[PDB]
Ligand binder design. Structure first.
Ligand SMILES: O=C(O)CC(O)CC(=O)O
Ligand SMILES: [Mg+2]
Ligand SMILES: [Mg+2]
Lengths: 296, 296
């Protein structure tokens, strides 16, 4: 059956802005984030404490985390790819961090020269450091429904890596269809294998709409009992590993569906559409949200 | 559970084109339909035999039906609103016609001008003639998941109309979310009420993606056992009852989902994309197919 409430994780300011062609000033980022908080989102991925030399679009991570209004009860997780970034994030006041791995050997190797097993040693250091500081850690498992290099990905394999993340300390793992090649059957098989080893409450789904399958894959996950899904404001984002089509599932199209289902999200659609319109103008782009297009 | 095979009903050349800003030459329509035949679609809504007064985009209906190649096995149904339209269709060689009703009263008044009950008298004569003429007839029930004038529409009222159409001769009734406001739950309640009165094999779904819910509502119908769904080539068309937003579910995105689910469609995706690209160019527009944008 369908959950009664879904926790929506907004990734537009990080996953979205990181993979957008144009860049916006720090004040725009802070304003966009305050607008999503005003819209009622309970968790907003804010920035990434990664080297400016590798991903310059996230270069203002320290000032963004310190400049945003911290609404009551709302979580503002930040990405910390390594120990150095983790220490900076903590020093900047972060209370939740996010680490990312993959269920694909080829993807991991072409992204860090380390095998899936090796990537977990780098994670152990952060998780040990996070535990000593009482900081929460969310995990990202990319290529959960297919890899741009290996093609099909085994469910057992995704279950294996997710389990590792969870036993290592991550209170929540987001299974991501990074290139958007997944379809509901694939989603179903994957989650079925993951749920055997990880409790339902620790799972989240993050689907890309590159092939127009994002919302349908999310619904399958909801029918399977997942109660947390990642999405980006106006469908901002994209994937470096896929032809310049679309990226993240649009938060507005997701809440529209959830409200129709009678599922609580605690999100105000009108105010979410304002945030989307705002960032879209700052970026000189058209929103990828269909609800936004149909509303005005 | 999910059916082993699905009959995709391509409506791009009629539904799609009738609801597009720009128009195209008769030779363009003909070639589009031949390309759609090439791609393997088993049923292609070819044109509409309606007055050029109302919709001039469909004026060339006679020459279009006569000029398109007739591939073995493929069906080329055409719309016939009044008895005179049905007259011309038969003469032009039509072997299948389409009559369109609506579960919404106000809608039947803005569309053609009469009572939902009165509109059944018209359909009777056509169905009667169609029976003498030996022509199979397909029905269209609009506002199946809501109306732009009445708002919510009851599953009972939809079940009522579908039942009337089915007992009156139609071998298949296409239930359509003309404004694309439906969500999975509404689709389920609707299908549920209709399936009580009409066998499943005679049901078809037609969902617009105006709010980005088309593929999800379609997945729900498939999960309910519906095995024929309507879609338009490159997401061609649009709803006259809303802003400048998308219209019909894009056929390429739907076969990608079906192929992903291992469901037989018999459609060649690459040739389908060729067809989509061909028409978008003639229309001087950008495809609304995500799959198209990701493939190239
Ligand atoms: O975590 C990501 O989604 C991307 C990385 O942080 C940036 C990189 O590609 O190096
Ligand atoms: Mg993403
Ligand atoms: Mg339509």
């Amino acid at each position: 059956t369908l959950p009664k409430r879904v926790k929506i994780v907004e990734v537009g300011p990080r996953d979205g802005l990181q993979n957008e062609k144009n860049i916006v000033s720090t004040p725009v980022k802070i304003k966009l984030i305050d607008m999503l908080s005003e819209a009622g989102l309970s968790v907003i991925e804010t920035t990434s404490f990664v080297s400016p030399k590798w991903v310059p679009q996230m270069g203002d991570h320290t000032e963004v985390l310190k400049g945003i209004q911290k609404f009551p009860g709302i979580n503002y997780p930040v990405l910390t790819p390594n120990l150095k970034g983790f220490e900076a994030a903590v020093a900047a006041g972060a209370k939740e961090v996010v680490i990312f791995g993959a269920a694909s050997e080829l993807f991991t190797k072409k992204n860090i020269n380390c095998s899936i097993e090796e990537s977990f040693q780098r994670f152990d250091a952060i998780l040990k450091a996070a535990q000593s500081a009482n900081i929460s850690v969310r995990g990202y498992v990319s290529c959960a429904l297919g890899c741009p290099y290996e093609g099909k990905i085994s469910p057992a394999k995704v279950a294996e890596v997710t389990k590792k993340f969870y036993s290592m300390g991550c209170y929540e793992i987001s299974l991501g269809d990074t290139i958007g090649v997944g379809t509901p059957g694939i989603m179903k098989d994957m989650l079925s294998a993951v749920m055997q080893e990880v409790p339902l409450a620790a799972l989240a789904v993050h689907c890309h709409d590159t092939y127009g399958q994002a919302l349908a894959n999310t619904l399958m996950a909801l029918q399977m009992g997942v109660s947390v899904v990642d999405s980006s404001v106006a469908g901002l984002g994209g994937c470096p590993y896929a032809q310049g089509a679309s990226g993240n599932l649009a938060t507005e199209d997701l809440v529209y569906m959830l409200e129709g289902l009678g599922i609580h999200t605690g999100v105000n659609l009108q105010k979410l559409l304002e945030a989307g319109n705002f960032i879209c103008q700052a970026l000189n782009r058209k929103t990828s949200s269909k609800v936004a297009q149909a509303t005005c």
